[PDB]
Symmetry: D2
Subunit: 317 residues, 4 copies
């Protein structure tokens, strides 16, 4: 029996018997993703090249305008904006959204996969809404996920009910549910990080990669894959198993991926799908943030691969 993203979101909203704001939110966000997707695949590029006589800025505008006009949000934090955006009073609702509107576009000149990452919170205060309202830890997420603009476009949605993957059918502009209640493999065969930073690696990371290239017990070495686009690397880890790493080194004691709108949503999707995500010291979702653009190390993926990483991590104290 066929199911769409919009009908799935509408039913989950019906069962919660809430105000309906989170339903309007997710429908607004899904509409923005379809618009971004069309723009990313270069619809209308012929007009810019004279047939009749910016992508990360346009994407950021779509998500902002779609979220504001949903009447479901009060605080908006974006990778593109130095400060939180406070939704005007007439359009305020009770949700806080952190998003990276087009992750990976720094390298979009080469047509690498790009994505939209988001995490949604309920306001935990009563005062006038502020940047403070988005400084909740990952565990407080009500929903998170991403849209991948790869060889095709898929939205991956995480809630307490689990992870569901919807494929965008461009013929009709509808997200079709294609993978229900996804669970990640217990252990994978692929490891993923930028190894050009090897001279700066934490010594514990240096051993784990050694263990992947050179296995102790007669096993085959892991394959290496690193697209350089987080949504692409994390989705492949979800589909094929394995591990993804962008860790803390000494030249970067807090990693480089941003916590509120990259590490937390991916960590949340990973945990709801039977996987793990750690800074190294604590679970990613247990970090309490003090600044909306602060960074965080992240190692996520199949539980056996993250555990094996943690087994080695404690060997270096």
């Amino acid at each position: 029996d066929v199911n769409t993203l919009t009908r799935f979101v509408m039913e989950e909203g019906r069962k919660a018997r809430g105000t309906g704001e989170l339903t309007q939110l997710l429908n607004s966000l899904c509409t923005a993703v379809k618009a971004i997707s069309s723009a990313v695949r270069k619809a209308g590029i012929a007009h810019l090249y004279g047939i009749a006589g910016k992508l990360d800025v346009l994407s950021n505008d779509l998500v902002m305008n779609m979220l504001k006009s949903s009447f479901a949000t009060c605080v908006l934090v974006s990778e593109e904006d130095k400060h939180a955006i406070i939704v005007e009073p007439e359009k305020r609702g009770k949700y806080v959204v952190c998003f990276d509107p087009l992750d990976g576009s720094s390298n979009i000149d080469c047509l690498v996969s790009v994505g939209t990452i988001f995490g949604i919170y309920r306001k935990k205060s009563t005062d006038e809404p502020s940047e403070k309202d988005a400084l909740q830890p990952g565990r407080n997420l009500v929903a998170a996920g991403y849209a991948l603009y790869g060889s095709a476009t898929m939205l991956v949605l995480a809630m307490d009910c689990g992870v569901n993957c919807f494929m965008l059918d461009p013929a009709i502009g509808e997200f079709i549910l294609v993978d229900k209640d996804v669970k990640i493999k217990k252990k994978g065969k692929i490891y993923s990080l930028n190894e050009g930073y090897a001279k700066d690696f934490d010594p514990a990371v240096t051993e784990y990669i050694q263990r992947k290239k050179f296995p102790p017990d007669n096993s085959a070495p892991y394959g290496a894959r690193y697209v350089g686009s987080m949504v692409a690397d994390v989705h492949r880890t979800l589909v094929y198993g394995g591990i993804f790493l962008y860790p803390a080194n000494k030249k970067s004691p807090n990693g480089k991926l941003r916590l509120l709108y990259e590490c937390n949503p991916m960590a949340y999707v990973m945990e709801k799908a039977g996987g793990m995500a750690t800074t190294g010291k604590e679970a990613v979702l247990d970090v309490i943030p003090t600044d909306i653009h602060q960074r965080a190390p992240v190692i996520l993926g199949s539980p056996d691969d993250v555990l094996e990483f943690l087994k080695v991590y404690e060997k270096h104290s």
Copy 2:
């Protein structure tokens, strides 16, 4: 003044003073690429999942095959998907030979990684009945070669004697728009690209070159690493940003792993026409003479300074 793939192809045909076959060929193939692109982005997938109640690389291979045959411009077609060369039936014969990988990367297309189509075109070097031998030319004889990348958008990269040209597919009207004329690769890049999970098996020269990239001698910054696992995506990133790509010969695979006729050769041609290099380690990829249509070959390609810096290490190890 606006320029499309069709306008570019018709204009180059005028300058070549030919029969017009290669123009129908490139136009037919470009039509197959539009159909592949549509299937890859999952048009009609709602019908597979029950809205009203064939694998992609088999579909891709059929699109390319049927479009090329029906161009009346080919005689021998070599495909990654077919163990033997296809001999185009006589009433549809033309003078060109086409080697192609109809959907390179599809081993990992389940994760929505970038995938592509790769192609290389030769002029038939015979008068007799056409045969598999007509595809056993080295890359240097290539008349036209390139790829379509099905990435964040769909781009066709077309390399000929006049140089490398990049066309963007506008899905609203199904047209390849020329967006980069006469492309050239940076002289030297800051990214290196290969699968390091095979590190225990590396040639000692490869092990040193990667070591030189992570730990630079002259106190410079180390290179960044990228490896998508899909050749078209990695090669294209190498063309746009410069850098180096490696799927080299090790000992356990003395001939590399990538296929020569429809992966190494088409990519080598694009690289050389764009001011870059592509080497097996011992000779330039385009100078290898093939003895089998599916034979493998090592490949190291990219910005000219990086392949030279690699060959210096390769020759230091005699």
Copy 3:
């Protein structure tokens, strides 16, 4: 403020504080409309013609399966099905839908405009659902409308709040609201019927048309338009005003157009937009049906034009 069909439908349901069923029904039905539109415009036709080596059945299948899987319906009446379909128990909801999945399709070989017509009732009886639940008169309609696949694709949705027109953006698969709370002109300058039936016309119809071609007063005669596709002619009548006729003659004392899934929805759209729709003797929404595929004559459009006709019909009565 941007407004989509999805936002419009959800907002009306929120204010009504109902079960949420009618919202998923209309959302499911609109998805079926997007799929029909893609098929009508011949997407993928290159595969039927050998690039790699039924239309009104496909449409009926889309509306059927999409309505069933919405969990909001119990009885489905289709122009394509001889008897009413009773949705199986585990998928039942409290609504009844009469629909024409591809009206006009006999002339689709010439690429004339075609359409999808629908009307929605609430189950009124207390029994097990049955064909009787669909034999309500038009006045009991909860919602009705059409999709027109013309030069572009538009969904026209009429409810108690009035008539609203939504334009399908194929780049993103979204119905964009483009005409809020539309009303038909008091009097138009176009009349629409098949004048090849002239020898069989009711004597009152023959006089009314004569009045349009040869005006009694100092006025200009009406222009004539007849596409032959009910959705197309009815939409032109809403946009530009005027009158549409498919009346009772001698060969068909009950006309030819079907009451439940052609005459009723159009009459409901017409009335909610300030127009009228009459059989000649009674208003279309006042006919009590005894068989789901029964016919009814129809004269609809601007009220002054329907009235002027009714003055003539009673003169012959």
Copy 4:
């Protein structure tokens, strides 16, 4: 065996051993048509309504003009949208004259009625500097003519000396697929098409002919009536289903209202190449020599038996 418009036009151009100009022309016009179709179906309309925070007939005329100019195949362009003929600048000139209605039916596009692009192509008949004089040839001089209908689907109908061929636009891939080879119209149809609201102004011959269709003398069934009000839609139905279409001369309009160069002539040429007829009443439409580019002409076209039966009635009334 599958054929596209692009393959078909390139193959016919090869067979004619011509300059390639008409090939460049039709490919540019077909590209303009795909872009028109995308806008007509309201692609991107969400952006005008604030999703992120120019009328169809002006855009169509601008698309067709720009594609034709930049094809290097034309010198004079006549459009319903332009008061005087357009003279293509010297550096972009070629030998063809094109008369077109860029978005016929668009006065009522608010009701989403089917609309279309109509076009006719002549060879320049002078050696002088090109001018409006070059567009005043009769229909018999037509080299190619036809239309694109933006209906329930988008179809391009192309008529040449080789006959009439119909191409369906596959929006999934942006390609015109050949779906109807060498089309021929019924000898006699069962549908008549005109605006009968103008009844008080009819020519007495039209009044009798229409009377004969509603009330048949020879005891046959009466004809059906269809009139979309959009020439391309009504003419296309007459081609696919047979029958007769009329926009004739009355007393208040002795020349009808449809324009001769870019509505009557192309439809007449398609009609004749497809085994049908098209008359002013007095002469065949293609035999009229025009004196002004925006001049009107009466037209009765369709199946040969129906136009003949009408002419018998027309000659009965002198």
